[PDB]
Structure formats: C-alpha cells, structure tokens
Amino acid sequence: GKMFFVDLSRCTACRGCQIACKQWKNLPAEETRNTGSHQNPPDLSYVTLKTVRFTEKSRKGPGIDWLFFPEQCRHCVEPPCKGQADVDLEGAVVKDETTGAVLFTELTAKVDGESVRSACPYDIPRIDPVTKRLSKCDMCNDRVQNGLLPACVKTCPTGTMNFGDEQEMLALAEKRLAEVKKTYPGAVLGDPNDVRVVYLFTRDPKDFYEHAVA
Amino acid sequence: ELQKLQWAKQTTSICCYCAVGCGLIVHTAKDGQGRAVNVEGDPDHPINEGSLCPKGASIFQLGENDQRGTQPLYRAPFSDTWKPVTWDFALTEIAKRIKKTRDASFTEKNAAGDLVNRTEAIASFGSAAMDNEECWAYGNILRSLGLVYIEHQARIXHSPTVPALAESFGRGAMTNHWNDLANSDCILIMGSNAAENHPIAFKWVLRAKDKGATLIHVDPRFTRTSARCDVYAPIRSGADIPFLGGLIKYILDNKLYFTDYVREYTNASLIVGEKFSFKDGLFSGYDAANKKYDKSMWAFELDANGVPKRDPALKHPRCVINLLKKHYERYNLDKVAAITGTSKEQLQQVYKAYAATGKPDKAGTIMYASGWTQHSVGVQNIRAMAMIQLLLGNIGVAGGGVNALRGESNVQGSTDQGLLAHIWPGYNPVPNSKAATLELYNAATPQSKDPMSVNWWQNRPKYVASYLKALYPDEEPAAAYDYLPRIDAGRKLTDYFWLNIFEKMDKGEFKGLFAWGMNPACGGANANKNRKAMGKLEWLVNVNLFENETSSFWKGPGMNPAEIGTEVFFLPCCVSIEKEGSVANSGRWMQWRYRGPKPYAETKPDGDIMLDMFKKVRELYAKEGGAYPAPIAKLNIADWEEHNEFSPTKVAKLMNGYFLKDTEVGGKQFKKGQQVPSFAFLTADGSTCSGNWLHAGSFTDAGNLMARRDKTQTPEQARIGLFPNWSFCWPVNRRILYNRASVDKTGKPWNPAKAVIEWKDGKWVGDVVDGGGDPGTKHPFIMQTHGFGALYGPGREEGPFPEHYEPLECPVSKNPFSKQLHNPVAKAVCDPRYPFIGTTYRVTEHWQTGLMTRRCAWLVEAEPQIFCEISKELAKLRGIGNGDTVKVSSLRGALEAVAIVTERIRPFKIEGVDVHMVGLPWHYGWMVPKNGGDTANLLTPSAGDPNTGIPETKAFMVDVRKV
Ligand SMILES: Nc1nc2c(c(=O)[nH]1)N[C@H]1C(S)=C(S)[C@@H](COP(=O)(O)OP(=O)(O)OC[C@H]3O[C@@H](n4cnc5c(=O)[nH]c(N)nc54)[C@H](O)[C@@H]3O)O[C@H]1N2
Ligand SMILES: Nc1nc2c(c(=O)[nH]1)N[C@H]1C(S)=C(S)[C@@H](COP(=O)(O)OP(=O)(O)OC[C@H]3O[C@@H](n4cnc5c(=O)[nH]c(N)nc54)[C@H](O)[C@@H]3O)O[C@H]1N2
Ligand code: SF4
Ligand code: SF4
Ligand code: SF4
Ligand code: SF4
Ligand SMILES: [S]
Ligand SMILES: [W+6]
C-alpha cells in the first residue's frame, strides 16, 4: 500500500498544498471573510478536501510556537467511515487495496451522512448540503495509479509532504522523528499503525488541532 | 493515462510571480490548439523540483479567467463608462496622442543650450513583469520617442542594493543563487520574510539546516519564516545599522575575520589620505549649509603611478582596516542591545554563530529584501552587511554571498534592459547634457594604473558602440549617439525618478503616462495624492491583464468621472503561459519559456502591443513629419519581427548580438551575420552589434543557451548545485560572482569540500572563473576600478563607513553613538494623533497590489480581506478584540481592516517607552474582490530619502480605532 509522511517541522504554511488540491480537481472556492486569522477556509467542506490550520501557542522568550496543520483524510488501514457506511449501502465507501486509498463513490448519497462523519475519529467526512454526497481527500488516487505523486505532495517546497510505499515511508518517519526530536523534543508521529497519512507533530498533536489524532 | 491530460500538449514555462524562477508544466487542450487544462510544477526543474507556492500553483486560474481583458477599452474625457474598441483604432489614436504631445514638448537643446533631444511631457512606468526581449524593445521604443522619465518596480525596493553592492563588489546583482543556499553553514535572514515572499528558497534553506546550518531570522515580527528558523531575534524598525555595526565590532575585537582573504582581496591594506576623519557623527569635509560631503577629503593616498598606496602589514594607522576598527569601537553590546531591543544574550548568540563563518571551512550568507531596501538607511544597511561578508571571507564562496532577493520574476532583467531613468541596457549610463560626444561619454569611465586590476569597465566603449549598432546598424556609433535623449548634468539625478514623476504629475507637468504592467493607483506611496495627480493627466495608456485601480482611477473612491478629463486606453496583454520569451531570476538565470495556449480572446503579448503601437507612430511621422523625426524612422525594428509579429527568438539574438561584417577579435576569425559568442569579442569600431553586452553569450551559434534543460554536472559542480547547463546566467554563465575570492594565491579553494573554482592542470575547473588570469595575477573584483572588495567606500554620499542615523523620526530623540541624530545628508510632521508605527508587508498568497491575485478565487479564498496585525498590548490599550473591524488612519488617509491580535507582534522599548507597531498588507484595492478593502498606500507618506528616491512604506505613523 501507499503512505504520506508529513513532517510538520518543515512546514512554512505556504498553502501551496491547499491551492494545488483545488487546481488538480478544479474545485470551486468558498466565500470566506477574515475573522482575525490567516486560516481560510476555516474548515474542511464539500468543496475543500484540505485546509492549512494555524494555531498560535505562547513560549518563553521571543516569538511563539506557530503550529501548521495541512488537514486531510488519513486513509485509515481499517477505516471506520466504511464500516458505518456499509450499514446502509455496501459499495458507497471502497478500499483500493493496491494503493490503500479509502474512496467515497456516488452511492454515499444513499447512506447516512452525519453517521459516517461521527464514525470518523478525525472528523474528516464533509456532506454537500443539497446533493447529500460525501467528499474528502481521495489520495489523488488516479495520479498515484498513473505513477504520479498526489498534487499536495509534488507542490510542497519544504519537504513536509512525502509519499511512496508504506515500508519506505514508515522507515523515513522513524528516521526523521529521531532527527527532529533533537530540536523539538516533544515530536511524535500521529497514530502511525492505523493511518496512511502519518503526521510528525513537533509537540502534543491536540495543540495543532482537536482531531489531529484519534 | 490521466483523462485530464490525455490529449493536451505539454510545454514548459517559468512562474510569472517572484524571482525564484520555479519551472512550470502547462497542458494545453486539442494538442496545443485549445485552452490550458492544467498548470503545475516542472518535476525536472533544478530550483523547485516540481514544487510551487500557492501563487505559482494557481497560475491555471490566472490564465483561464473570465474577468480578464478581452479587447482594448477606451474612456473619453469626463465619461463614466468604458467603450469597447478595436486594436487598429486604439493604436492609431495612441500614436496621435504620442506625436501631438511629443512635438509640443520636444526640447532639441536645454536652457544651457546643450543637446538633449528629449520629451519631458510623457512618462513611463513598467515593467518587471514583461519578458526580457519585451523589456529591451520597450526601453528602445521609449528612448527613440525621446523619453527620459522611464521607471519601473526596481526603483521602489532594490534601488539601494545596486549602488551599495556595486560600491562593495563592482556589481549590483545577487552574488550567489537559490540552490547555493543549501551549501551555507549560517543563514542570516534580515529585512526578508523569505518563507512567504520567496517560498521555494526554503527548500534550499532547510537543506542547509539538514547539513548542519544554523538558520537566523532578525525581524520586527514573528512570521512563517521565523517558525522554521533555529534563532528568532526581534529588532525594532530601522535599528539594523546598530545591529550590523555591533557585529563588525565583535568580528574585529575578537580577530574572527579571515586575515589572508581580508589582506589580499579587500581594500583593508589601502592607505586613506590624512584629510579623512570622523567625529560627533560627521565625516571630514561636511558642508553644513547644503547638507552634503566633499568626498575628495576621503580620497586614498596615491603612489607615483596614481595607484592607491598599500600596507600589506595592515599596521599603518590610515589603513582602511585600522580606521574600520576605530570607527566601529563605539558599537558595544550594551548600546546595540538598548537601541535594537535585542537581548545582549541573543546578540552574542547571533554574533558568535555568524562570525564563526570567518573560518575558511565555514560559509555564512545574508538573505535580505524590502525590510532593508524600503528604509532610508537601506544603502548603509547593505554596505555594512557587504563589509561583514568581506571580513568573514564569505564573498565568492559557495554558501556565502550577499543574496539581495529580487522581487518580480524579471525585475533583474527589466533593470538589465535599462527601464530606469539613469541607465541604458547593460548598466551603461544614460548620457547627461555635458556628454556632447561618444568620445566624451567614454572619457567618464575611470582607468587603473594597477597591472593586477582587470577593471573590466574599460571595455565599455565596445558595449556602447555595439548597443548603438543594434538600434542603428547603418549609422556610425558617434552619429547614432545623437539620436538618444540626455538628462540635465545640472539637475539632481532623482528628479527623473518614480518619486518626482508623481510630484511633477501632481503639478500637471505630464500630458501622457504609460502605466505598462504596473498599478500606480495602488503601488505608489500616498495613493490619495497619486489618484488625484492622475486626473491632471490628459491621456493614460494602461497595458495589463485585467481592468484595475489604475485604468479605472476616474471611478474610484470619492472620484467624480464628469470632473476628470483624463483620456484612458486599457490595452489587454496575454499571461506568461500564452507567450514565448525569457525572464532573468534573482540568481541571474535567464530562463526560456514557451506558449501553451494562444493569447486569450484578442489579448496580445506586450511585444506585439508596443511594436504595433510604435510602427503607427513611425508611419504617422513619415506622412506628417514633426519634431526631430530621425531616431523613430532609423530605429532597426526589422530584427524584432518574423511572420508579421514580435519575435522573442530574433530580439534575443539581437540582444546577444552578431557580427555586422567579417572581423578578427581576440586573435580569432568571425564571419558576417554570425552570433557573438561572448562580450569579450565585442568591438567599438562597428564590426559588432549587441542590444545588451551582458546578453553576449546567451544565444550563440551553439544555439539558445537560455533554453538549455540539461542537468549534467561534474562532481565539484553537483556538490554545490551550480547546474551550469540549466539555462544561462550573465555574465558568461558565472553562477557565483567574485569566485576568484574563493581560492588562494595558488588557486586552491579556501574550502575544498565546497570549491566554486580550482586551478587544475593550468585551467579553472568548476564555475566559469569570474575574471580571466592565472592564480595570484589579478585582484578578484574585476568590475571594481582598483580590484578589491570595499570595506571603505569613498563614493557613498553618507560616508565611506556606514554610521547609525535614526530612520524613525517621531518616537526617537537620542543617537547613542554620536551627537548627530538624523541623516546629515538627506520634515515628517509626527502629529501626536497618530502615535503608532505603521508598516507594510506581504503574505505568501497575494502578489504586489493584488491586481493579479485578487482575480484568483483560491488566493482570495485563503486571504480574502485587508487585515491589521497588532500586539496583545496594543489590542488591550485600544479595546480591540481579534476579528474586530478597525479604522487605520494617518495624515495621508484612512481605511477599515479586520484586526488580527497576536503575540507575533510585540511592543518595542524605545527610551524606556513602549512603542506599538501596526502591520498591514498592501495587496488590497477598491476594484476586487467585494469587501477586500483598499490599498494600505492610502496611509503612506509621499516624500522620503531624497538621495536614493524611495518612500517610507516600512515605518509611517498611524492611529488604529475600533469601529
Ligand atoms: N508572496 C509574495 N512574495 C513576493 C511579493 C509579494 O507581493 N507576495 N513581492 C515580491 C517583491 S516585488 C519584493 S521586493 C520582495 C520583497 O520581499 P520582503 O522584503 O521579504 O517583503 P515584505 O513582506 O515587505 O517584508 C520583509 C520583512 O521585513 C521586515 N522588516 C520591516 N521593517 C524592517 C526593519 O527595519 N528591519 C528589518 N530587519 N526587518 C524589517 C518585515 O517585518 C518583514 O518580515 O518580495 C517578492 N515576493
Ligand atoms: N506600502 C507598500 N507599497 C509598496 C511596496 C511595499 O512593500 N509596501 N512594495 C513596492 C515594491 S517592492 C514594488 S515592486 C511595487 C510594485 O508595484 P506594481 O508593479 O504597480 O504592482 P502590481 O501592478 O500589483 O504588480 C505587477 C503587475 O504586473 C502585471 N503583469 C503581469 N504579467 C504581465 C505581462 O505579461 N505584461 C504586463 N504588461 N503586465 C503584466 C500584473 O498584472 C501586475 O499589475 O510596489 C511598491 N509599493
Ligand atoms: S505545501 Fe508543504 S510547506 Fe506549504 S503549507 Fe503545504 S505542507 Fe506546508
Ligand atoms: S492527496 Fe490529492 S485530494 Fe488529498 S489533499 Fe492532496 S491533492 Fe488534495
Ligand atoms: S480519516 Fe476518516 S474519512 Fe478518512 S479513511 Fe479514516 S475514517 Fe474514513
Ligand atoms: S511565486 Fe516564487 S516561489 Fe512561488 S512558485 Fe512562483 S517563482 Fe516559485
Ligand atoms: S520588484
Ligand atoms: W519589488
């Protein structure tokens, strides 16, 4: 299967990944206002599969801990969204066994939306208010199938975004975690046995987002 | 295959935003014949390796955009509506407005009776956004029409960089390049927010850290850059000289300077004349009356030949090095800590880390941009940093350099093409009224009696000749010389610059303005004055991608179109992906890009707009005559054209240059019509043309070197990321400038593990050597008269050593380093109703005035509205809650923004008083989007430093009140 290693110790919150996702799938933009934050859109939605979250945390001495979280579907090895969807209509949520992608199909219109969202321990699934279909990061599965990196991965300048075979990426996550601990001692991988999107947080993941880890 | 791309033609391009110069892949439908379907990174490009920040990443949405211009619009005097109009009409009526105004205002000879052959009724702004070939041809079109008021982007920011670095090293350009950052041991980011404003640079900054580098951000604010550096040090606005002066004192006091490098390669050993002195913050030869210096009091002592005398012992008390030690003794940590606001502990940490790069096996680099260049102290900030780099032997080495980060994609190129009032292409000065002949013009070039000083500028006559033989190939250079306009020898040079152009326009001394790929109505400091000033124009030609605040100033906030009589032609140009051509990035990489989709609707490349527009002036002058016809009729535009339209390939070949007849140069035979293989083989006798001597080598007989996409590297090249076969850089593919300084007297690298060049088997191996000659035979700074890195610069107006004079006029009353408080060479009101220091800056998501990015829904999505960033302390003092609407006001205007309250802004301790800084983006404008807000330049002062000609956009007094 495939995996993302996301090294948040390298993230400049450039939001190249946020725009790349929308360009590749030609998603529309949400109506946004500024309410006292660079963060926008403020939350994932039917038309936003990835948003960079910004949290400011105090530290001793000059500056702050600025925590950046490019949020997306974790593509769980055993996805709860599938089990909760299968209750209503098997086929609505599928697993591409070659890549590991957890993929919503057009049949999520038939299943219960709120149910499948509540079952997700990362609060990822988003429902179109009118059509009642569910959308989320699809791992850029067709790009991966055609031997290309996902849009958000290829676009990332810093080396935050990494993608490949789960063996090489777990090995990278391990090796990078040991190195990054030297400067950020509270550095941890997010649920590295359960998910195909393995975030390295520089501190307590909940500092980055309430649902950063299950 | 992927269905999205399946039947789309794949073409390469270069990003149309910042000067990193990231590679793109464009997919165009119907195998090239349709619209662009996809735009993303070029995985093979050696700078970005397929990565793009949100601006490059959204180029699809910029190109394929239904808000874009479709055809020329026209606005009639006192009208309130646009009128759709044909190209044939627009350029016929344009030509008539040019000729009328020209004839009426042409001065054959100035008041002193000297030949100038110029027009002072027409001005031109722009553009750093145009292709190099379009910039070159644009400049030549404006000068053939006799314009002298020719300015663009480059004046506002890096006008100080070029003089400061030219005085220091002999060239104004970024010394190293983006890939080279990864070789640095200590990266000092100061006056730069590079993670936001050159985002792909951080690929290479973070790779430096991977290999042991310390990353240091020195900034008044905590930014996205600060988040990913090892050291964040606050500094209060305009306290950079004290910071850098304290680092000079530290380096000298602690013998941390690289003695051999300093002895041989800097002017450390040169003896200053006895007439040089400094006391009470003033240099010798001060004229208190006029507020200016007698620079002859600073002149070196000269030996019998006229060569500056030297003590290689470095013992003579008038040695540059010993005067330097004396000058910077005053900059102790306690004083520097007190004025910067930076803790003594943090100053020591930073000084220790950076000064450690004095070791030959360590490289230190500085990354700065508009945080330095948009301050009145800019030129001395940069001088000081250049002096620190020379002391530490960091100039000419991999991981070293002064990385003056260029802004716009082709600001380097647009400067190189002479779209500034004071220069022709190739940094040959625009003649003044006293340069009555070519021979007199070439007399101004200073000579050196030193046999080891290459003094490459002595070749200027070959470049000026070849430049005149490109414009006028049938004429003798000496005759051709009279066709081009001249500035007044008497008048202050800055009178021809951006600042004064708006001053003059506001006196109604301009009939016409070319706003060519710029947004003055948002870009210019004091937007209220500038939008009113533009009314007093008769006509305005705006060339751009979209309708904007400039083209439509007449229907702007509190404007009555019926009262405003200005005539306005909006001509829509095509985006970067709809045309072929080259752009010169910050590292001087001249990169060739191709057309994907053909121009949208009836939009045209700028090349076609200006050429067609010129030809209509040219034909109209041939049927009607008028003022001094010669330069217009004779200008060689045949070389610019192929198949009835602008040819980037042919313009680029003319810019490189070719032999106008058989010639022997440097003992080699060259045929007629053949391409000049480098500027070394140009002549002053008319045998060669070259539009730009810097471009000689860029497009040879071997082919278009700017189009090379070849990652072939030797081990030594690959080890430091030279990529000498990817595109081409001026001069002659020297990737790291001053690289002779990276080796000793025998040609052995100071740092073999990161060798730039090495003397191997009677050859220089690695980078192209910056100056020909065997090891130890030449001084390494070949563009310098004397051949040395200048620690002591006797041509700088504010003195040969940078000295702290307070740029913040209002909240400061004490210079702790002298009796001289403010700049003794350069009237801010400091009205107590505006107690806070306003500052302007950018976000990753938006571009410049936002004309381009306020039309891209994904960037507006991310950053939809103007904001005002304030400390918790200011928020509390003024009763502002995060997300509250706030009124920001100054003497110049007022606007509303949303308040962003954050610990990323902190108050500054200035003389035991808390002073509050207020941050605003200048990306917004009344046109789009709805509820975006307007330009922060409603708030900024108009005037500024009269020496450099730059407004104070980085420190201006404001009030902020809840709504
Ligand atoms: N995203 C994006 N990138 C851009 C641009 C853009 O509009 N958007 N524009 C391009 C252009 S045209 C240019 S010239 C460059 C400019 O690039 P930068 O100079 O990086 O741009 P700014 O964001 O204006 O400010 C740089 C930093 O200077 C700091 N600063 C302000 N005053 C001082 C001071 O007195 N001392 C010090 N040490 N720091 C100070 C600010 O806090 C800020 O962090 O960016 C280019 N790249
Ligand atoms: N307060 C404040 N003011 C500032 C600054 C600041 O930091 N603070 N920054 C200053 C600086 S550093 C600069 S460079 C200036 C910039 O000021 P301007 O150059 O006026 O800024 P824009 O017009 O927004 O940006 C460049 C323009 O190029 C246009 N363009 C893009 N492609 C093409 C093309 O192919 N052809 C043509 N003809 N046009 C094209 C874009 O549409 C855009 O209008 O602003 C300055 N003003
Ligand atoms: S592209 Fe990379 S560096 Fe930029 S915000 Fe996304 S993950 Fe962070
Ligand atoms: S993997 Fe594809 S769908 Fe998922 S966030 Fe990245 S670009 Fe968007
Ligand atoms: S993160 Fe949520 S939506 Fe994505 S696979 Fe896991 S349970 Fe399903
Ligand atoms: S704006 Fe600059 S960093 Fe971003 S993609 Fe373009 S060239 Fe690269
Ligand atoms: S620029
Ligand atoms: W700029």
Numbering used by the authors:
A (entry chain B): 2 to 215
B (entry chain A): 36 to 861, 869 to 1005
Show passages lifted from the paper:
Molybdenum- or tungsten-dependent formate dehydrogenases have emerged as significant catalysts for the chemical reduction of CO2 to formate, with biotechnological applications envisaged in climate-change mitigation. In the particular case of the tungsten FdhAB from Desulfovibrio vulgaris (DvFdhAB), a selenocysteine coordinates the tungsten ion and the enzyme displays a simple heterodimeric structure: a catalytic α subunit (harbouring the tungsten active site and one [4Fe–4S] centre) and a β subunit (with three [4Fe–4S] clusters) involved in electron transfer to/from electron acceptors/donors. In the active site, the Mo/W atom coordinates two dithiolenes from two molybdopterin guanine dinucleotides (MGDs), one terminal sulfido ligand (—SH/=S) and a (seleno)cysteine residue from the polypeptide chain in a distorted trigonal prismatic geometry. The allosteric mechanism involves large conformational changes, namely of the side chain of Met405, a residue located near the active site that is fully conserved in the subclass of Fdhs that contain the recently reported allo­steric redox switch for protection against oxygen-induced damage.
In this work, the M405S variant was engineered, which allowed the active-site geometry in the absence of methionine Sδ interactions with the metal site to be revealed and the role of Met405 in catalysis to be probed. The mutation of Met405 to serine (or alanine) led the Gln409 side chain to occupy the space left vacant by the absence of the Met405 side chain, resulting in a backbone rearrangement that pulls Thr408 4.3 Å away from its original position and causes it to interact with the protein backbone near U192. Additionally, the catalytically essential residue His193 displays a new conformation that is closer to that in the oxidized WT enzyme, but is intermediate between the oxidized and reduced states. Therefore, this new conformation, which is associated with increased backbone flexibility, is likely to interfere with the catalytic role of His193, possibly accounting for some of the loss of activity of the M405S variant. Met405 was previously assigned to play a key structural role, but only in the present M405S variant could we confirm the significant rearrangement of the Ile191–Thr196 helical region (particularly the mechanistically relevant residues U192 and His193) and the consequent distortion of the metal coordination geometry.
